[PDB]
């Protein structure tokens, strides 16, 4: 396997966000059972957790998003849950879940056409930003 990161000397990260967005290449898409992320996302997420381990002084915010198709009062708890799924998975990689924040915004800002299930699938995403 891989060995734990060597001891730092200077600052660990100037801005871990640049490492996270580079690894993710985008937001986290969901699908399959719906309450699960895409199989390819886990692969990317494992790579994200790696960076978190490489930067234990960093806190991450996992904000969940969904489309405005369902009820907003229902969308919010959902978005938060999907966000938690990601947070949980990171913990399983050794990442401190206490330094991981989960936010559910429901349907606040769509990015794709709701007229299509395809675009709707983009409106429902999870994003990881460094706090």
Swiss-Prot record:
One of its GO terms (molecular function) is metal ion binding. Its main location: secreted. The keyword Transmembrane applies. GO terms for cellular component: cell outer membrane; extracellular region. Keywords: Cell outer membrane, Cell wall, Disulfide bond, Ion transport, Membrane, Metal-binding, Secreted, Transmembrane, Transmembrane helix, Transport, Zinc. It is found in: Secreted, Cell wall; Cell outer membrane. The keyword Amino-acid biosynthesis does not apply. Disulfide bonds join 13-55. Residues 17-131 form the OmpA-like domain. Probably plays a role in ammonia secretion that neutralizes the medium at pH 5.5, although it does not play a direct role in ammonia transport. This is Peptidoglycan-binding protein ArfA. It comes from Mycobacterium tuberculosis (strain CDC 1551 / Oshkosh). The gene is arfA.
């Amino acid at each position: 396997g891989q060995a734990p990161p060597g001891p730092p000397a200077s600052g660990p990260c100037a801005d871990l966000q640049s490492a996270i967005n580079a690894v993710t290449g985008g937001p986290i898409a969901f699908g399959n059972d719906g309450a699960s992320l895409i199989p390819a996302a886990y692969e990317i997420l494992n790579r994200v957790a790696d960076k978190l381990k490489a930067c234990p002084d960093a806190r991450v915010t996992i904000n969940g998003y969904t489309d405005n198709t369902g009820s907003e009062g229902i969308n919010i708890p959902l978005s938060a849950q999907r966000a938690k799924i990601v947070a949980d998975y990171l913990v399983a990689r050794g990442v401190a879940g206490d330094h991981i924040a989960t936010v559910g915004l429901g349907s606040v800002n769509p990015i794709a056409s709701n007229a299509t299930p395809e675009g709707r699938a983009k409106n429902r995403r999870v994003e990881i930003v460094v706090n």
